[PDB]
Amino acid sequence: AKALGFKYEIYQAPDGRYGHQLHNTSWNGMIGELISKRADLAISAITITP
Amino acid sequence: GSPYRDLFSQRILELQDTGDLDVLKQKWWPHTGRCDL
């Protein structure tokens, strides 16, 4: 935001516990919020799986 | 304008989840001793 010149807003996760592949064929935590697609960005320690 | 790069990198971490990357190293360059390590 300081070297590109645009803006931001901040949510908080309702689970916040390294969100998981649920039994609902779904993701909780920070993960499914961007899969229900109801936030925009997530900046954390992300151990990427394929 | 190239959708396949995810489709590229899809296998890539999968290869990283194998280590077949290193298996593909071993053909053109094996990891063992040139004379004795």
Structural resolution in Å: 8.1
Please identify which residue in the block is written with the tokens 């990198």: B9
Phi, psi for residue B8 in degrees, rounded to 5: -65, -60
> What technique was this entry resolved by?
cryo-EM
Please list, in sequence order, all residues whose beta carbon lies within 8 angstroms of the beta carbon of residue A34, skipping any fewer than 6 positions away.
A40, A42
Q: How many CB atoms lie within 10 A of CB A28?
A: 19
Beta bridge partners of A27: A21
Q: Are B13 and B5 in contact (CB under 8 A)?
A: no
**How big is the CA angle at B14 (ends A44 and B2), to the nearest 5 degrees?**
80
Interface of B with A in 8-37 (CB under 8 A): 10, 13-14, 17
B7–chain A Cβ distance below 8 A for any pair: no
Using only C-alpha atoms, what is the Rg of chain A? Answer: 13
Q: How far, in Å, CA of A13 to CA of A43, rounded?
A: 12
